Design a protein around this nucleic acid. Structure first.
Ligand SMILES: [Mg+2]
Ligand SMILES: [Zn+2]
Ligand SMILES: [Zn+2]
Lengths: 79, 98, 1337
RNA sequence: GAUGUGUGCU
DNA sequence: TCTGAATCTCTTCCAGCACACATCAGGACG
DNA sequence: CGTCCTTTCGGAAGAGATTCAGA
């Protein structure tokens, strides 16, 4: 469940980068096969992404590092 | 009254008006300022492109929505091309650079 | 895909390049088997196939034949959408002038050829001839000859030289004209000539010619040899009901043009006589002018119903054009509307969507789950399933709707709170249930207004709706730091009734053991909600490092105030509910909860307050009856006394003791006093009515009158309205404004007369017509404000400036209108403020003045803080985040990249509906006295007389802060002096409103220098006193002998020589103006500061704000001194009197004409400074700009418009007005060129000058000096660098013609151009997108 | 489909 | 007797939203 | 049918356009 996004704004201190980071994570959960990093309570992808931002285990830097690591792994497995 | 998709106008490919014609509410000039004040750039873009004039990016959004996806490939509103052609129908050459 | 939009003229080669064919037959669809014609306005071979992937003749019908043009009819097999993209063209038999470039005012054709518009139009419409290539004759290249003159010229000089007419002659003139030679000649003439009107005309001409040379245009392209046509699908022939085809105005205009074009071609093939083909060419010219811009000619042609038909230029401009109807705003899918009801069970983030409306909005979302759960196999199956509304699509809908916010918009979206996103709850019904606490933000009651639901589709749109537009995130207004989630009118009546004390109860001596026992006793009916019990309550406080420590106490409260304590969160003091909570008390309770506990506890608290107010307002049964409006027993006696007094005044008037006006004023005053007495008696009898036995003898208490309770709580009521219900209605005004001298002596409880009710309707309909005509005037103002300031966006984070404005508390002469704390809160300082421990730094240079710093500034008693304002920011095309300050909606600095110029305009324009549309100095308090710009002398009576108009008398407190400010006129006697401790309630300065004196400074003898009776003095002796009054006549009445002789009153010594004025080497020559009566006689000793001679002598509504923001010059502008130094006169009133100012050191080339209507505050013997007033009246905010600076004009605009708003009780922060002022200061004229490439009188943008000068100073060169300009919000929008914003704002034709001739270019950098084009605005998330886009190039 | 008229609601 | 300042015509715009009706070249010669 | 044809209850900026009255 989600009502207020204040803690997420505290973690990503712009509220305009928060929208972009949460949208990126929600599109990862929705279009991609990525699983949520938090036990969902039958929430939608946007609310799960916002909660993961609140719990602290995602931001723009973490998402970029994870994407770069997975791209490197896919390149290595390509041979 | 409510409308998801219906008939669209002829010269400007926008949703029709009123309740008799299965028409959509007019996101007016003053509501655009309210979206600009919030900073809601993506909501505003999907208001004036996808669920409006832009015909090519309007069916792709419908397919995405009934595809499990929520993502738009926006283009140029077909009412701006109407404006370009109506200005070009005067003795005025108006064009897009690169 | 594209990063700029370029507009220019169109060459005939370019127009042929656009076209896919030529239209030659003026015939639309065949009125047959409905197929297009051969070469008509609708044609398959030119524009495209009517059917998709089908040829017109029917030879090809499939996709495999795509690309090959047919042979029978020449129609390529392709999409049918090419009929709205492929243009044609018309080859005009004769050249035709574009109406836009001929009648744009100024005329581009008329200005390019330096010919008047009348001559150009005469030659164009074949009413005369113009001369080309005059040769070796007496006829020049720009001479006009009528028919008889042309016949005479052919008789005398009928050689190969030719003169022509029509657009062909003008095209020949334009083509034979050389641009560069004309530019050189006109630059030389500009350098040579001295006439200023000639100078500006020449520089306008040179600007046009240089713009034509630079751009890839040619002068003769204005004359249309080829005229293009719109594609058919943009001017469709829609089939009406029947075999008929609905009219299209463009098709009629195109057929009209082709008719005359074909007739002209046929006539020119037949070698018809010259007059007939001349008339045919004139008719073709008129047809083309009606096609392009119908109505710009004298009489617009009408197609049918005697109404002008819509041309090409009429569907690009105006409210019904392409810009303001289909591009700036548009109709939107996935949307609906319905009536709104209450639904008080919702939470702050919830709305209630009808179950039949959410199934239509979220229809594709339901499809995408009926096709994913295996409940359907294709789109048709799911479509029919939701069509028949099975019992399985209601749980699919309840899952789609789970956490998908929807926007709720109310039609007059005045500010941004009018669109908020709510989580939907499916309800049975057809009304959109809307939470009660957001109604104040929406300005929405439930008397029948409707809302529109919009559905955010994409993930970014949903997360914007949740993180930016959610009603949870908007509990502070963006206009000021005020809360917007405020309980109103039923929640506050419930909380007022619950938290009140009556001195008796069911249980009043009982001592409770907690709030829960209080609720248990109230619900059981063992105690009253208004008891006076002692409850043992534990309250938490976070005085530690964010840690809550408890304290338990035994407090004397009521049962209701203890029941309410069960909802107040942990952290708030108990003395927040231990009172009688009105509206302000609980608004302040929510405000302190927000600042102590944050946002989430406040959002939880607001719903609890709403529920517990509704419940205990329902439980009270707080009704209203007719016995609740208590008429005073003394109302009849007061009315009778007033009747007796007006009868006495009438008796006095009949005897002739008083005049008509005095009688009227006395009657009005005594009736006002009677109304005040009735109101006071009624209010006392209402407020303290309830007398209740206190378990002893008897006691008074605040009354439980129902109407008084709902007036006291602030729920719904005032003092004026309760006065009109129980007291008397009072004095009513005529429609013009004059008060009727007999008030309404009755009230709504006991009737109104037939005449007393008709009298009320004057002011009843005045205030309804006002609000009817006021909406259309406030909407225009907020639209202009948005379009001026639309594109500021906070772009940088710090600009590093040491400039700013000196924020000081505003003092009008009495109580402080606004303290320093409100004017300086949440803004970044510019310099370190000095504590009165002088030379010790109190605050740093770039700190954010939040509440903690404002309290510290107040403790040290500072009264002037230099702060960083938006108008002084140094960034380009944006505003730094530090030169703006607090967000005012969020509790931090403004985020980089968010549109402050739209928030400013909305915040200023939203309260537009609340504004209307149609002596001696008495020091009030204790303190010291200061005089600004001291210029005074001691009078012989022992006191001071001041000799300068710009003085200010300031009453200072004992701390040192400025508390009162007054203006002291010229020659006013003081009662005390500077630095002397005055007593509150005494007059300090005295003067006369009339009788302007010419008082001296020192004593001596007076000799009437250049004063003899009959020459400059008329013989007009005051008959009342008999003293010979030396009255100098004015300019008109005096003879010619008194004009060249200027009277003077020189103060001499005993020997008759010149008494020297101290401080200078000039004597005391006092020149007298007209109407200066002299009571003193010759040979009289004068006093120190005695009157030698005496001279006897607006709107604050919405129009005032519009005039301030549009910078209109007032009718009688105050005159200001444009240079310092001494002042004198010149020629003897050369029509208007010439005033000459001479500086002490520099030369004196300045001299201004002044009409004798305005009385000069200055005399011939004063040294004036620049910016000081030479007359009286409202200053135009251009003189302030160019004399007193930029900060002076921003302070003037801010103070004036804020006074207008504050008179009506509207709070708007000054950031917004400073933003609009900054957008009003964008142009900057050039003084001298220097090493830059700007023209001399060219008005170019300030940021361009700034960047050019800063890159010149980086090198060894020297920049350019500029004079800052100020334009109104309507002129600063049309003169912006983007021709798309200007075209979509106003005057589309006037902007597009200038942009076309100048070959202008649009970079799409604002907020409106990106909306029009269709890409992301550079304001929110689009700011990050545009930063990436610009960094990629 | 465009315009006009009129009513009404904000 | 050529020139800057004071009058003289003509341009533009005047908040948003639904909903009823009417009119859409038609007159006329061939 | 087929087909051709032709007034008038506004207020500001501003851009001609004239006048004036002055040297
Ligand atoms: Mg209402
Ligand atoms: Zn064919
Ligand atoms: Zn700045």
């Amino acid at each position: 469940a989600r009502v207020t996004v204040q803690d997420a704004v505290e973690k990503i201190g712009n509220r305009f980068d928060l929208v972009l980071v949460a949208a990126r994570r929600a599109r990862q959960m929705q279009v991609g096969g990525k699983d949520p990093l938090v036990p969902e309570e039958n929430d939608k992808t946007t609310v799960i992404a916002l909660r993961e931002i609140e719990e602290g285990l995602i931001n723009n830097q973490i998402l970029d590092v994870r994407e770069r690591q997975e791209q490197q792994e896919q390149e290595a497995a390509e041979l | 009254h409510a409308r998801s998709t219906g008939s669209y106008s002829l010269v400007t490919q926008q949703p029709l008006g009123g309740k008799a014609q299965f028409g959509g509410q007019r996101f007016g000039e003053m509501e655009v300022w309210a979206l600009e004040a919030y900073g809601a750039a993506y909501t505003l873009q999907e208001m004036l492109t996808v669920k409006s004039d832009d015909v090519n990016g309007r069916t792709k959004m419908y397919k995405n929505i009934v595809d499990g996806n929520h993502q738009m490939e926006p283009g140029m509103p077909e009412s701006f091309n109407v404006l370009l052609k109506e200005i070009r129908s005067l003795g005025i050459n108006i064009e897009l650079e690169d | 895909e594209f990063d700029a939009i370029k507009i220019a003229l169109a060459s005939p080669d370019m127009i042929r390049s656009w076209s896919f064919g030529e239209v030659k037959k003026p015939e639309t669809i065949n009125y047959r088997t409905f197929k297009p014609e051969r070469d008509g306005l609708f044609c398959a071979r030119i524009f495209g196939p009517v059917k998709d992937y089908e040829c017109l003749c029917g030879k090809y019908k499939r996709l495999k034949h795509r690309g090959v043009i047919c042979e029978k009819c020449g129609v390529e097999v392709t999409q049918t959408k090419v009929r709205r993209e492929r243009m044609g063209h018309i080859e005009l038999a004769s050249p035709t002038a574009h109406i836009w470039f001929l009648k744009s005012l100024p005329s581009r054709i008329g200005l390019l050829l330096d010919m008047p518009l009348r001559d150009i139009e005469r030659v164009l419409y074949f009413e005369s001839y113009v001369v080309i290539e005059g040769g070796m004759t007496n006829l020049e290249r720009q001479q006009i000859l009528t028919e008889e003159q042309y016949l005479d010229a052919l008789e005398e000089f009928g050689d190969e030289f030719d003169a022509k007419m029509g657009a062909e002659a003008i095209q020949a003139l334009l083509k034979s004209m050389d641009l560069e030679q004309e530019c050189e000649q006109l630059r030389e003439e500009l350098n040579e000539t001295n006439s200023e009107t000639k100078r500006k005309k020449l520089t306008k001409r040179i600007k046009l010619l240089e713009a034509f040379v630079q751009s890839g245009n040619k002068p003769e392209w204005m004359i249309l040899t080829v005229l293009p046509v719109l594609p058919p699908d943009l001017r469709p022939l829609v089939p009406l009901d029947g075999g008929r085809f609905a009219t299209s105005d463009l098709n009629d205009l195109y057929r009209r043009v082709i008719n005359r074009n074909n007739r002209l071609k046929r006539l020119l093939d037949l070698a018809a006589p010259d007059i007939i083909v001349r008339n045919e060419k004139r008719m073709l010219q008129e047809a083309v002018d009606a096609l392009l811009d119908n109505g710009r000619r004298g009489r617009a042609i009408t197609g049918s119903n005697k109404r002008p038909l819509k041309s090409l230029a009429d569907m690009i401009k105006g409210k019904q054009g392409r810009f303001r109807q289909n591009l700036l705003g548009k109709r939107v899918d996935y949307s609906g509307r319905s009536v709104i009801t209450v639904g008080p069970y919702l939470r702050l983030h919830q709305c209630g969507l009808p179950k039949k409306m959410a199934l239509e909005l979220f229809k594709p979302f339901i499809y995408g789950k009926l096709e994913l759960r295996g409940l359907a196999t294709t789109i048709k199956a799911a479509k029919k399933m939701v069509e028949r509304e099975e019992a399985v699509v209601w749980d699919i809908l309840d899952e789609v709707i789970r956490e998908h916010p929807v926007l709720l918009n109310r039609a007059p979206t005045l500010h941004r709170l009018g669109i908020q996103a709510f989580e939907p709850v499916l309800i049975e019904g057809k009304a959109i249930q809307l939470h009660p606490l957001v109604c104040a933000a929406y300005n929405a009651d439930f008397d029948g207004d409707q809302m529109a639901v919009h559905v955010p589709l994409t993930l970014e749109a949903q997360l914007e709706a949740r993180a930016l537009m959610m009603s949870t995130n908007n509990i502070l207004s963006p206009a000021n730091g005020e809360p917007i989630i405020v309980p109103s009118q039923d929640v506050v009546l419930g909380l007022y009734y619950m938290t009140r004390d009556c001195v008796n109860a069911k249980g009043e001596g009982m001592v409770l053991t907690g709030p829960k026992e209080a609720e248990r006793l109230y619900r059981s009916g063992l105690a009253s909600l208004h008891a006076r019990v002692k409850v043992r309550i534990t309250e938490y406080e976070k005085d530690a490092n964010g840690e809550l420590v408890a304290k338990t106490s035994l407090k004397d409260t009521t049962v209701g105030r203890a029941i309410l304590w069960m909802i107040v969160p942990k952290g708030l003091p108990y003395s927040i509910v231990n009172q009688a909570l009105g509206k302000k008390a609980i608004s302040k309770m929510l405000n302190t909860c927000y600042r102590i506990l944050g946002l989430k506890p406040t959002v939880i608290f607001a719903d609890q307050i709403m529920y517990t107010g509704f419940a205990y307002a329902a439980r009270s049964g707080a009704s209203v009856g007719i016995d609740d409006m208590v008429i005073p027993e003394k109302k009849h006696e007061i009315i009778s006394e007033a009747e007796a007094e007006v009868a006495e005044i009438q008796e006095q008037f009949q005897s002739g003791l008083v005049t008509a006006g005095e009688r009227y004023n006395k009657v009005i005053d005594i009736w006002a006093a009677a109304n005040d007495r009735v109101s006071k008696a009624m209010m006392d009898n209402l407020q303290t009515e309830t007398v209740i036995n206190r378990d002893g003898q008897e006691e008074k208490q605040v009354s439980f009158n129902s109407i008084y309770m709902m007036a006291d709580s602030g729920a719904r009521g005032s003092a004026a309205q309760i006065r009109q219900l129980a007291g008397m209605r009072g004095l009513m005004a005529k429609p013009d404004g004059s008060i009727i001298e007999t008030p309404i002596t009755a009230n709504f409880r006991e009737g109104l007369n037939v005449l007393q009710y008709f009298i009320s309707t004057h002011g009843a309909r005045k205030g309804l017509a006002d609000t009817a005509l006021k909406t259309a005037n406030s909407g225009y103002l907020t639209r202009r404000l948005v379009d001026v300031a639309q594109d500021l966006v906070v772009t940088e984070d710090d600009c590093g400036t040491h400039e700013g404005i000196m924020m000081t508390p505003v003092i009008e002469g009495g109580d402080v209108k606004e303290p320093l704390r409100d004017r300086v809160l949440g803004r970044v300082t510019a310099e370190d403020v000095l504590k009165p421990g002088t030379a010790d730094i109190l605050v740093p240079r770039n700190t954010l003045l939040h509440e903690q710093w404002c309290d510290l500034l107040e403790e040290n008693s500072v009264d002037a803080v230099k702060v960083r304002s938006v108008v002084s920011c140094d960034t380009d095309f944006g505003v730094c985040a530090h030169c703006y300050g607090r967000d005012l909606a969020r509790g931090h600095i403004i985020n980089k990249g968010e549109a402050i110029g739209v928030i400013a305009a909305q915040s200023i324009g939203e309260p537009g509906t609340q504004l209307t549309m149609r002596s001696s100095i008495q020091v009030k308090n204790k303190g010291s006295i200061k005089l600004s710009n001291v210029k005074s002398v001691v009078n012989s009576s022992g006191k001071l007389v001041i000799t300068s108009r710009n003085t200010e008398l300031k009453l200072i407190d004992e701390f040192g802060r400025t508390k009162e400010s007054y203006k002291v006129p010229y020659g006013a006697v003081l009662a005390k002096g500077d630095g002397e401790q005055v007593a509150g309630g005494e007059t300090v300065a005295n003067w006369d409103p009339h009788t302007m004196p010419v008082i001296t400074e020192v004593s001596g003898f007076v000799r009437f220098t250049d004063m003899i009776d009959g020459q400059t003095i008329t013989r007009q002796t005051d008959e009342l006193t008999g003293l010979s009054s030396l009255v100098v006549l004015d300019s008109a009445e005096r003879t010619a002998g008194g004009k060249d002789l200027r009277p003077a009153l020189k103060i001499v010594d005993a020997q008759g020589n010149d008494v020297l004025i101290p401080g200078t080497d000039m004597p005391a020559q006092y020149f007298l103006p007209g109407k200066a009566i002299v009571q003193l006689e010759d040979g009289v000793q004068i006093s120190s500061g005695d009157t030698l001679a005496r001279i006897p002598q607006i709107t604050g509504g919405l129009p005032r704000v519009a005039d301030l923001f549009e910078a209109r010059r007032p009718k009688e502008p105050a005159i200001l001194a444009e240079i310092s130094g001494i002042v004198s006169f010149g020629k003897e009133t050369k029509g208007k009197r010439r005033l000459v100012i001479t500086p002490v050191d520099g030369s004196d080339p300045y001299e201004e004409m002044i009409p004798k209507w305005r009385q000069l505050n200055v005399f011939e013997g004063e040294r004036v400074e620049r910016g000081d007033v030479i007359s009286d009246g409202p200053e135009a905010p251009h003189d302030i700009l160019r004399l007193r600076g930029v900060h002076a004009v921003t302070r003037y605009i801010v103070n004036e418009v804020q006074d207008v708003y504050r008179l009506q009780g509207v709070k708007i922060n000054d950031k917004h007005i400073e933003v609009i002022v900054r957008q009003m200061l964008r142009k900057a004229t050039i003084v001298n060129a220097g090493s830059s490439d700007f023209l001399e009188g060219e008005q170019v943008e300030y940021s361009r000058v700034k960047i050019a000068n800063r890159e010149l100073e980086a090198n060894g060169k020297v920049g350019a000096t500029y004079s800052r300009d100020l334009l109104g919000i309507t002129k600063a929008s049309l003169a912006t660098e983007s021709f798309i914003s200007a075209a979509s704002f106003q005057e589309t034709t006037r902007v597009l013609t200038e942009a076309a001739v100048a070959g202008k270019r649009d970079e799409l950098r604002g907020l409106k151009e990106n909306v029009i084009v269709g890409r992301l605005i550079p304001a929110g998330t689009g700011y990050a997108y545009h930063q990436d886009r610009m960094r990629r190039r």
